[model samples]
Target: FSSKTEWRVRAISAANLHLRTNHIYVSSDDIKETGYTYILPKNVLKKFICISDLRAQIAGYLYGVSPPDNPQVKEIRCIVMVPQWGTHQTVHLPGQLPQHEYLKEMEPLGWIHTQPNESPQLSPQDVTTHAKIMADNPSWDGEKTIIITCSFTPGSCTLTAYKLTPSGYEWGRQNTDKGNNPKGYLPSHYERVQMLLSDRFLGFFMVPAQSSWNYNFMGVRHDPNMKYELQLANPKEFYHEVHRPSHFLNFALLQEGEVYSADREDLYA
Candidate 1:
């Protein structure tokens, strides 16, 4: 504590002993430009293959690692897709889906869902929904919770992503449930996310394909049957409803520069 010069240069160790003595430091200069860049490995996108029917909208969750050294960019290591039923234009989420400690352990990347009509849109309802979720999303700075809408229509699809603008954050924080501004947003209230893909899936639709806060997908072979063991303690917890594993999207890879494998439990942990 005397000089405080050498400590900033020290590489923080992997936290086998995190809570007791793990004090770390970072400079404000390094954090001046922070925004989330999401990377969805192709193996995760492969789950959409079996989910290609142009039917009901699906809701889902994003779980991943964003290391302390570089926390702005979040690569989704796993996704839990919850298919719901209500109507063609709307979706419902059941209470039976995983919650509590089942989700608390990982970096809360945000939630995703299907946009069945493929209109390339997000409603004011969608804005308010993200606003409410972002209030609880842990990283409420520039990199708050994000939304990915996979527009699945016949013979084509498109995965688009977005987040609230700072003004919109304050607006949504204030006006979300207040019968809203004529049910629409100021044109500048949100920013669309950038997506990266190498080879396209047959039904994959195209995005505007350009924007700030650039995010690109990592290139990995889209292994169709790629799966991870479910961490749920009671196997019967979500067994009967929505068919548990069928809707999930996932990947075996970790973030770039970090060693990970489907076989490496310690890496994802």
Candidate 2:
């Protein structure tokens, strides 16, 4: 399979050419700053939307795109997903039903799918206290945590969470698992969990098994309902431009070569 055609033949023969995961480059700058990023490849049959953006779209659907003429920022409720913390935080003005009370109303507001028994079962008091701290600290620049913004009145606002599973060749696992469930994957368990999450759903990302080396990452989003006809096969292509950002957040390729640094000889050795 030295030639591209030969490689294509081998790839198609392997079966399931329609959806295969491969290492792709994503900008280090993008992930460090934005938490995630994506590229709509020319070969891509569908557009991939980040979960955070999707949550924002849902919020806009519920609340006006912009604050109403009689706007009240204090009345607004913002739902945010803090990936680093593996939890969702709700922020609302002081006089509202209290931060904890607002979190309780999230399900009816469409900010949350549901509080599965395994979901973070924090007490109202605990969540309120945590929310207050998060609000006061503000993770993104000076902006408070917000993925979805809803208000009695709105000009614009937006918001975005995950679980882990562990198994072996002797066992199997799925992404939606919970309870005694680990909030994050152990190093040994990361790969299996990454594969399952990447294959089954849209918007999950893999940080590659090895860090401090090759900075390759991966992401995937295929239309769930299968409304569009499947594009069976396409030419293999390399994305090196912004149109195909040379950066991604999962399934990276191995670093090309090894380098020895005098300052860290022991570590490399």
Candidate 3:
């Protein structure tokens, strides 16, 4: 938002402005809220408001009142904004989520995260890889909950996290001898994996909320053939990226929010 151009956005309800409030999308010229004001740059006043201009304008509005006076305030954050119908990005084929790295420590235990297999098999080394991942990647220093989600076609299925060891199945094989195998020896044996029944991967936060965030991923896949594109992200590394900013475009522009149940007469004291 330029300093010269002004815009007005009203809270959907003034009574709960600080609560789970909603904002009324209106043109700058239409804002008539008393005591409220705008902050914009000089450039916007001279030019017309393009569809994209709303971003800067909204930033300006938020900055004026909640100005990041505290350095600790998140410089970047995003809301769980739903977009207008038919605007969310979509893909037909199953899309691969970028591999998470440096997150073996954060990996939950007693559950195994293995590629789907046609045959049931497990090895001692395979078991070690599971433990190794969790040992290497633990949760952020002092975080209680974490977010991990998938980016693929819309579907409703449970996603799980696991800790796998090679010692529990119908055959009861053990993961105690992976060191002396031949160079290209592939085995048909599958390992028994333990289910960390109580814990599960929660969801993900792609564009995170701070200036000092880390990208703690849980997996990575490498292929010997075919092209694979990956886009794992670091929150601090790209604070100003369009999607990383506090006020950025969601997938859909103007999805209708829940309507207030009461009438305008009962909105405020």
Candidate 4:
């Protein structure tokens, strides 16, 4: 992660990693195990960019839900991670999980964290923790076991994803039990998943403009005689932004594009 680091991470690349495996979230069928296709949606990717590391690291569990009959898939549905909990710049899960209505369908799928200014690289601890989680969340296809991280800063928002390789998974679990049988990470395990951005948005109300353009409304208070019409995101421009490597922060960090919903208290800012 920094100059103080000298760890190795070996991973395979894939075009499949960035496929359009995203499906509808709420469906009703027989219900139920095919995560064979695993791809993050654009909406979700945008949320990852929203996570800021102005000071502390961002970390949390990605709780997923299964669709109906055709549903071995886990929808990376909701995040229960509290911001302050990750302020330690390390990993720490809550003793107990909070409640939810779809609690029965929701399953623990992966862990996500951001390296502040750097992309995610497995730390010795990262490997250990990943193995520990994989043990609890069993999957016939170990490849589906995932860990993700975002490189978030003022300049850019880049993402990287992974799952422990067979060897890495085995070593991680074994080493995790023995405490210190290993000097450091083996570096051979864990492969990379491809990263692709989407223009599709969820949860954010994006309305097209009068001129056949689209925008995400920040907000406009009655007293907002003109503080911010509030600006809206033009999806067209954003789609083009996906190709740029350096200036890829897009709307994720924009103050005006942030307020999908706001009240008087929010407008004060």
Candidate 5:
């Protein structure tokens, strides 16, 4: 088996609640400047949207946990998985462009897929939120493994890591032709609760489990759906770069914080 992959971390900052901060490189001149209050600049606000998925995953940053507890600037280094954009079509923006479609233009430019509706050969892999499942039970078997947490007569259900394929790999366009789920491939559960993250506050709430899955569902099932949200406020302005055969993307944040000087005597990895 391959070694476990660590999260790709990055640093984010903002000047104020509304004013967006620029891209502040973590290992540069100093840390005294990047504090929790260091708001992101207008130019870099788009970066926040780019990795909104990752920010929502961790739930919250380590806020005020670094060496200089009261440092002027606080740095957040979390696993980052950047999203891939796609361009559906073009429009004459200056001629009353639809406000909602404004984002349609930023799709990543690339080769065109003639049969846009065509599906893939195998199953299209989905990025599962492992943190959610593992957060409660470490030994939880997301697949067919038996469940001992609850009594056999009564049980619950949950979603966990599957689709071991590397991040950013596309399965839909490749697997659909083989008669896979047009929406995407399912892990052991053969289903999942539809999760939606609010545009405001960057939070996601899972729909009621028992309501969605009768008693037959497997894994840890919870009520009021599992609510996971991040506290990072919006901070940047942005634009679109469109491409053909459109697609949507999710993000995962990744970055490494400063190494303390006291570890001098410790061995390096």
Candidate 6:
């Protein structure tokens, strides 16, 4: 948001708002310190509504009412929002083994030795080197990214705060001899958001009411990947993007079973 827009946002809400309650997601230094765990509140959250025009939002900030230039609230007749869900586990590196266990197993000649019937196996250290390069120089901050198993659900999943470690763990390929089960690293009974559309309809806020008043209200940021011209040049895609749900809303919907469908090919991706 520009200075002009930012100042207007502050001025408008200054009159009507004060701190209600700051949750861990909004205030914590390291939200991951909570282990990405949370309980859903038994209350209806105020939705943040997005007005189409920047000027009108500014005007609403100036006067405590809708701007005359764009007075009518835009209405969406029918829009299909695809909800994607599944077991939201992130695969931590060197998975299925604790830090100490992995360090021990990775000792110089530990896994290097093989049975008489078999040829020499690769050392864990050697495998580690190859895997690092294969990952093309990934950020391996091991302490925060590790999670062998996560049995997360919508009701239980916590709100991940800004700049905090998210709920998912990192993973890599497993051995072929181990039945080639990637998801197997997780326990059998762990709950999963199966990628199947439900024969159910649910309530949604067209635009959340909070968006109008909250300065730090969650919404889409400018997409760095997309060019400025392209965002303006293609109104359909870019404009629709601005109206897209916040990460919190997206995950919450998935967890609640309100939206659960995947793309045609790679659903998770």
Runs in model 2 lying further than 4 Å from the true structure: 1-68, 72-114, 118-126, 134-269
Residue 39 C-alpha lDDT in model 1: 67
| Candidate closer to the true structure by lDDT (higher is better), 4 or 6 | 4
Q: TM-score of every model?
A: 0.51, 0.18, 0.20, 0.49, 0.17, 0.17
Q: Write down the worst ten-residue block by lDDT for model 2.
A: 55-64
Tens-place lDDT per residue, model 5, 51-75, is: 2221112111111111256533312
Models, CA RMSD each: 21.9, 21.5, 23.3, 16.5, 24.6, 25.6
Model 5 alpha-carbon drift over 4 Å, by segment: 1-189, 200-269
* Candidate number achieving the greatest TM-score relative to the actual structure: 1
Candidate that beats the other on lDDT, 2 or 5, i.e. the better one: 2
Candidate 4 lDDT over 1-269, as tens digits, reads 23122101101111222231232121112211222333445665544434323333446555555556745455565544421223224444432333344434556556667554553356555677677666654542365556776544334455566668878877777674434235656767766654334354242212122221111111111121212111132223211232223334434566865476655455455
- The segments of candidate 6 whose C-alpha lies over 4 angstroms from its true place after superposition are 1-134, 147-171, 174-269
Clashes, model 1? 2
191: Cα error in model 5, Å: 1.3
Error of 4 at 213 (Å): 37
lDDT of each candidate versus the true structure: 0.45, 0.21, 0.21, 0.44, 0.21, 0.21
lDDT of 1 at 269: 40
Give the per-residue lDDT of model 3 (tens digit) for 30-89.
322222222222222111111111111110000111124642211111111111111011
* TM-score of candidate 2 against the unseen true structure: 0.18
Q: Once superposed on the true structure, which residue ranges of model 1 sit more than 4 Å away at CA?
A: 1-34, 67-70, 82-86, 94-105, 136-142, 174-184, 197-269
Q: After the best TM-score superposition of candidate 3, give how far the Cα of residue 39 lies from its true spot, in angstroms.
A: 51
Per-residue CA lDDT of model 2 for 80-128, tens digit only, reads 2211111222211121121233234322111222111222232232233
